Paper text:
In this paper we describe a novel filamentous double-stranded (ds) DNA virus that infects a host living in nearly boiling acid, and show how components of the virion (proteins and lipids) can diverge considerably while preserving the overall virion organization and mode of the dsDNA packaging. Like most archaeal filamentous viruses, SFV1 contains an envelope. The results revealed that the two most prominent bands contained proteins VP4 and VP5, with apparent molecular masses of about 16 and 23 kDa, which are encoded by ORF23 and ORF24, respectively. Surprisingly, VP4 and VP5 assemble to form a pseudo-symmetric heterodimer, which wraps around the DNA, in a manner similar to the symmetrical capsid homodimer in SIRV2 and the pseudo-symmetrical heterodimer in AFV1.
By trial-and-error, the correct symmetry (which was 17.14 units/turn) revealed a largely α-helical protein capsid, while incorrect symmetry values gave rise to density that was uninterpretable. The three-dimensional reconstruction showed a total diameter of ~270 Å, and that the nucleocapsid within the outer membrane had a helical pitch of ~47 Å. The asymmetric unit was shown to contain VP4, VP5 and 12 bp of DNA, since the 3.7 Å resolution of the reconstruction allowed building an unambiguous atomic model for both VP4 and VP5 as well as for the DNA. Since there are 12 bp per asymmetric unit, with 17.14 units/turn, there are ~120 asymmetric units in seven 47 Å pitch helical turns. This means that there are 1440 bp in 127 turns (120 local right-handed turns and seven right-handed superhelical turns), so the DNA has a twist of 11.3 bp/turn. An interesting difference between SFV1 and both SIRV2 and AFV1 is that the protein subunits contain N-terminal portions that project into the DNA groove. In VP5 approximately six or seven residues can be seen making a deep insertion into the hollow core of the DNA (in A-DNA there is such a hollow core, which does not exist in B-DNA). In contrast to the compact dimers in SIRV2 and AFV1, VP5 contains a small C-terminal domain containing two short helices that projects away from the dimer.
Author numbering:
A (entry chain a), B (entry chain c), C (entry chain e): 4 to 134
D (entry chain E), E (entry chain C): 1 to 194
Amino acid sequence: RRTGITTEDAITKYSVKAKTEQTAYKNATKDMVVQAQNIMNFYSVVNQALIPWLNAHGVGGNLRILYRQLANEYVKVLNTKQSGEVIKRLKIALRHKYWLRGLDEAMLDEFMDYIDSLKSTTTNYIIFNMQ
Amino acid sequence: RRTGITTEDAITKYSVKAKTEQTAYKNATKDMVVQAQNIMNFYSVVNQALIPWLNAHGVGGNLRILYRQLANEYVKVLNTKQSGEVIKRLKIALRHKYWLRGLDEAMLDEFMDYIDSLKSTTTNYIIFNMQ
Amino acid sequence: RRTGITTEDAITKYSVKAKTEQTAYKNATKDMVVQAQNIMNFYSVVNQALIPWLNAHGVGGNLRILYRQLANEYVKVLNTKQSGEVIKRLKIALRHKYWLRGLDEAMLDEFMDYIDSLKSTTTNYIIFNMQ
Amino acid sequence: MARKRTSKNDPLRMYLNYVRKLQTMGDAYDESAKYRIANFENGFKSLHMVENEFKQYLANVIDEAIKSGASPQDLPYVNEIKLALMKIFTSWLKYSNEKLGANEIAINVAGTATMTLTENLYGTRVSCEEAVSLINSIFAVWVGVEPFEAEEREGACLVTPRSPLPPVPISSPTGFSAPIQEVLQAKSPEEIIG
Amino acid sequence: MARKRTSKNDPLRMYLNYVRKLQTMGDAYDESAKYRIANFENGFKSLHMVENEFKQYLANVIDEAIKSGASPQDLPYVNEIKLALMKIFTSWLKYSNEKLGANEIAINVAGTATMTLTENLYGTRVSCEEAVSLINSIFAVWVGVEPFEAEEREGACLVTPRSPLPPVPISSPTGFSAPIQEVLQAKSPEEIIG
């Protein structure tokens, strides 16, 4: 396929596919039931490592989300299968980015030293089983 | 058959064959079910050889695709049944082509030395079985 | 029958026979099912002898077809039941013809020495069986 | 159409895709009839005109050779040798029917000349040099070129071109020819079109 | 389309989502027909025009080379070498069919030139320098640039650009072309539109 496509062609696709995309979402519910426990695995392995750190290092209520933004982006980079040779660069990239959004670096050096216990989350939960 | 054919004849074929080509796609779904696991074999044998190299040699997130462009074109040339006497020429052809799209040759010499562990992928998955 | 026939008579035949020729093609499908595996025999016995030669003698991707033009015309001359006393003439005829279409003779002498392992392909696959 | 993605040389996939699409070929042919008939209607005229022009100009060249005092046993050209010369001229019709250049037509017709004059003039009283002189005379009548130089250098005869060759002076039209009864029984021009 | 959230490299999820959506692809194709046909209607003309323009300008350049006294055995360009040159010009059609800049077109066509002139001119009588001179002559006919410098520096041939390349002088229109019978049999313009 190309790239360069007009504004009308994409709108024409999205408008005419409405019936098929909703009758495909109706089957994607059946598929989502068994695959949805990656949510449970994700928040288990993130809260089990961040609730003691945030809770005992002294950060407040509503800044915990900004720290979750940092940790969640790091876990996304992890479970797209990317090991330490890219992580040693994306750690200082994320450090500068969330310093730029108003955090304090006396928290950030300790937090970037802390996030090496977060790992990959998502697995597969549908086996083939031809029998 | 010839080659030289007018613009109207090809459009006349494609416009009048719509009913038969869609009722042939409806049977090609049944054929695609068992043949579609060449996708699984392909990405298994490509990721198993490229995820450690890309992951430990230090390349980023969004350049991994350009490296996949190189490796995927090499695997296509492989599984059209073409062994080393053409590969010893297409390696330097692909080296110049993806150098021309902005890569670095200090990556390319090591990567062209690396891609000899990629091999053919596609097999057949429908047996005849007259009984 | 004669030969010399007007332009209108042939067009009159082809235009009026449309119903009978399409209802004969509808039965020729049933006949084609069992006879179509001469395609399989043909490409098996041609690829099994040409893929190592083309693949290890160094010829490229898109010239393999021109070599297939030569080999396929030789296999047609074979399986119209024509043995060596005509082949010793048609080999040098085909050598001059595909030299004239831009090949190199340092490939052609070795290739004409190579094509004596190609033989006839087509068999019959419908037995009578009066019982 | 072909899969247009990769070769994937495997004969069993070939036969199995053929068996899969035999349940659609039988209807696509019935659908294809409606333009099949008109394209043959205005495509067969080129073949029939080039075959009549070959018959006529071969007869003229042979009669001008007989008027020079030769015998009709010297130059047979009866049934199969005329079929050979019609093979080379019909391949000239094909490579002119595409929009090919002049020398590409010349060398493809030279290759077909090599194959044809290799096959069917061993054992039949007619040397290759006389046949190639006859072909050059017919092209001198048609377009006035005389392009082919030949040799009997090996056991077969080999034809190579000397000059580029023009395409056939016959245009294949994109008409939609209607009967005279449809013209006379109609009431309006748009009834003939529509 | 893709999931657009994360990569999640796992082949079994790929095959399983494909098997899940095979019960909807077979109806989405039937729905897609109604704009598929019109987009091909006004998209195939660009291919057919650029292939005819290649045939014509290659014929002109080859005939001007023959008028300089060369032989038609010196420069074959018959079936597959023309197919190589059509590969590079059709990739030029693609990268011009997007709204890309000049040098981006130049280096993508140079990469396709590298791959094509690497593959199919080993073992066939035509050096790479003559082919690249021919490509530069055809671009001198079309847009008058002559962009590519080449080398046979290794066992393959390598093409690199010297100057930016303009896009193809052919516009792909967004028409809705109606038959002449629909024009004549109608009673109003809004019956043709509506």
